[model samples]
Target: MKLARFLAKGRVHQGVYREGLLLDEAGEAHRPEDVTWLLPFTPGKILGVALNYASRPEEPALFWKPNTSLLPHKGVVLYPKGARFVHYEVELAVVVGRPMKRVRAKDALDYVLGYTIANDLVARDYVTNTFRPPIRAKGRDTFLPLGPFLVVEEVEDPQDLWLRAYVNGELRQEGHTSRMLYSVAELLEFISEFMTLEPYDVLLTGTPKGISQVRPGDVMRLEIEGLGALENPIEEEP
Candidate 1:
């Protein structure tokens, strides 16, 4: 099922879509874009890894960004005041279905609500040039464009899926989840060992190579093999 969280009458509620019409639990179809899509579930701890894929071969990186940066559909991602370069990273987000600790890879899927696509709107200049800026570049009102919807199903093989990103419909970054050095099971187990993995809490796996810049009016679309597409437009901070 393709589930969505949007505003129809100005209230934020979770929904499912079918036959070109978004259906409520009551069995009806409605517009998918009517409501401002909030985080698919109640917001919880969000841990986004940095250079987790081996970017800094010579230097080890471990940093944390807050869940406060998350964004939803139709929301404009803002560029920091001095950031001359901001980039888009299309990642397969792992949405935890329930709280789990020390869960094994074989059982990891049991705790997953499903999968979703995410735009890891990154401020390159700030991130690469200096230490993680407190809120200057990442903590702005809407820095993370989170979702268009979520796919509630068992992904054929989370480790083997195509992840692609487009800028205004032009392909920019493409990757295969098979390349993830640390498998989803390892990641979940690693994080769970450290802290609690609560329901609705998101784990951003990581991004592929082609990290580029985007400005106001640019549309970014991220897609995964089993999941769906998540697109958002950019604009200068208002």
Candidate 2:
């Protein structure tokens, strides 16, 4: 099953898409633009991770993104004045359907609602571990670009999947789930231990290497096996 949030008739609705055609809960087809989009669920928060792949030992020294930093698919990313570095991190996100706590890796699958794609946009610029106060470099509006959809049963195994991201039609980040520093099971187990992931709450499993920046007019495409492709056009905020 694949689900999406979209705008139709000035109203926002969560819908399921089948074979490129969208259907409502009653098995009726819907016009994609008739509903406004919102996060699939009213997540208490969005949690993201960094550098959990074995592919790039050099690109990482940083990990984890604060809750306020999540962005949605086709959403805009704003960069304020005096910004220095802003880059993109492509990630495979796991959306928990059932509320779960202290679950083991062995049983993590039970809590999984579905899987989707996310672009963990980070503001590398203006961010430093400063003493006075640390800025929320990544926690800004429209920074996290997620789905075009959430895939359920039709997807492949999370443990053995392909991850790919492209910008301006050029390949940038690529990796296999097999190269993750922590397996899917480990991440699920570790996350559930202290944090209770509620329904619709999102968990980002981190990115592969070769992730980079994009300019306005650049097209960003993210794809994870089973989740299909999510493409967005990047433009500067007016």
Candidate 3:
């Protein structure tokens, strides 16, 4: 089922999305455009894997994405002032369904709740050194445009999906999940070995290779096969 959280009539609601309509908990249907989309779920912890497609990482390179950076579909991504280069990364986000501690790779999918698309927006100027933390480049507010819906148990094979990114209607990045060096299960197993993963915690499985600069007024649309498209506009931070 495709689950969504949105605001209609100035009130927040949770619903199931089907046939282009959002059916609320009370069995009432609301038009998709009539509601303001919110993150499919409030994430407990946001973790990211770096360079999972370029060269093989003996283990997944992990990082933190502040929850404050999250934005919903159609939201504007702020282009920070004085920053010359900014780019977008399309990633398949994994949502944890249960508490995980030292979970084995083979059984990691059993703890997955659903999936969503994420845009890992970055300001390249702040990331000049590989030794430094990417907090400024990646943790800025409105950097991550997360969801239109959270698809649960609907995607048959997460490893075989196609991920694509378009900027202003032009395709910018395209890749297959099969190219990932570390699968979702391996990532979860690696992460859970050190820290506990709770329900609603999000893991950005990493982006493909075709990243390029984007400027204000560009709209970024990301698609991951069955997991619907997530689009956000770019705007200057005034």
Candidate 4:
């Protein structure tokens, strides 16, 4: 089932996406073109992994992101001032289904509610001062553009999907989930050991090594196999 949050009839709604319409809980169909799309859910905690692919980190290195940074599809990614070297990294996001702690890798997938896509927008210039990059580098408002819809069933294997990114109309990044060092299940097990992931908490798996600099007026089209695509424009912040 694919779900999405959108505005219809003057109110925000969580609806199921079918064809080109959003089917509300009341079964009312709203044309997707006429509605405002939001992140599939209101995230409580946004955690992400660094170097989780290709055993790149030896172990899953995790980090936290502010939920306030999220921007929905078709939204603008503001290029903050004083920032230089901003980059776009396409990643696969895992949305937690239920609250769990100390889960085993074998049982991790069972806790997943669904899947989505996110662009881990980073200010490469801010990445130089710390072991864990400061939130300022990636936590600004409109930095994390996510969602077209939440995909729950079409994807049978999350580990083999293709992830790609296009700047304007040119391909800038590409990779496969099969290269991930720590799979989704393992990541869940690792993080759940310390904190309880409530429903709607998102885990952004790491991006592959195809990052590129982005500037104002550029369009980013990020796609994950079986998930869908998120395209947002870059704009200057006042």
Candidate 5:
């Protein structure tokens, strides 16, 4: 089943998204463009695993994208002041179903509520300093565009999926999850060992190669097989 949160009739609501229509609890149907999309769920914490597809890390490289950075589908991603190189990273976001601590990889899938797509927007200029946290590059408001829906009990094999990215309708990146250095279960097991992952905590499984620069007036569209596409426009910060 696919779950969604959206604004309609001057209020927020939970709905089931199917066949391009959103059906609210009362069975009222709304078109996709008739509502303002919100995050599929209000995440308690958003964590990310860097280099999962680009590295052979002894362990997962982790980072945090504060909740304040989150934006929903069709939201705008602002081009930072004087920043030249901005990029879009398409990732598979895993939503935690239950609290997890020191869980083993073999049992990690039991704690996954579902999955969603995330655009990890970054400003490459500030990422040059390897020693510091990438706050300037990644933590800016609206840097993370996530959701159109939250898919639950739908995906059969997370690792066999395809991830793609497009800029202005042109395909720019493509990679398969089978190439990932660490599988989803291993990432959860690794992260839960250090910090507790609560319900609604989102874990980004990293992006593939083919990242390129994006500028204002451009639109980014990201797709992960099974999950719906997430689209956002770019605009200059005023």
Candidate 6:
């Protein structure tokens, strides 16, 4: 099932997106355009991996995103003042369905609720020219355009999906999950060893190469095979 969250009857509720309609918890269907899409679920924690693709080295760097940075589909991404050059990264996000702690690699995927797309927007100027944490460069409001829906059943294999990113209708990045040096199960087992992953937690599996700068007024569109597309407009901070 493709689950989603949206506002209906002046209240927000979780629902399922199917056949181009948004069906609320009570099973009443609403026109897709008639409801506002919220961040699919309120994640208890949002973790990320870095440099985990075959295009790069094998060392997997870890990072965390501030929940305040989340932006929903069609929302405006604010180009912050100190950020001269901002870029979009298309990633296959793993959504956790149940609690997990110290899980083994073989069983890590069992705890996943489903998968979604994430645009790990970053401020190029803020990152180090060398290895270091990305706290400042990535943890800003409107930095993560998370979802349009959460898909569970349609995707046959998360490792074999194609991911892409487009800027105002122009394709900028294209990659395959099969190219990831560290698979989804490995990431979960590594992270779960340190912390308890609760339901609704999200793990932004890494992005592939082919990143480029994006400017205000440009739309960043991210798509993962069998998941869905997520689009957000860019705007200068007011």
- TM-scores for candidates 1 onward, in order: 0.87, 0.83, 0.97, 0.95, 0.97, 0.94
Cα lDDT, all candidates:
0.72, 0.69, 0.90, 0.86, 0.90, 0.86
lDDT tens per residue, model 2, 46-114: 666565765444422334445455455655556544555667777777878787788888888777777
TM-score of candidate 3 against the unseen true structure: 0.97
Give the alpha carbon lDDT tens digit for every residue of 40-91 in model 1: 6555776665555532333223344467777876677776666777888777
Model 5 per-residue lDDT tens digits across residues 116-227:
9999888888996573348778999999999978999999989999998889999998899988889999999999998999999999998876856799999999899999
User: 99-122, model 4: which lDDT tens digit per residue?
Assistant: 979999999998888899999889
Collision count of model 4: 2
Residue 106 shift from truth in candidate 1, angstroms: 3.4
For model 1, how many clashes?
1
Single out the weakest 10-residue window by summed lDDT for candidate 4: 51-60
RMSD of each: 2.8, 3.7, 1.2, 1.4, 1.2, 1.8
Could you give me the TM-score of model 4 versus the true structure?
A: 0.95
**True lDDT of residue 116, candidate 4:** 91
Residues 1-238 of candidate 6 have per-residue lDDT tens digits of 8888988669998999888888888888999688788988887789889877765555568889999899998889999886787888889999999899999999988888898889988897888855444678898898988988888877777899998888899998789999888899988998889889999999988886686689988988888997788999998998
Better of 2 and 6 by TM-score: 6
lDDT of 3 at 131: 41
Better of 4 and 5 by TM-score: 5
The list of candidate 3 runs beyond 4 A from truth reads 130-133
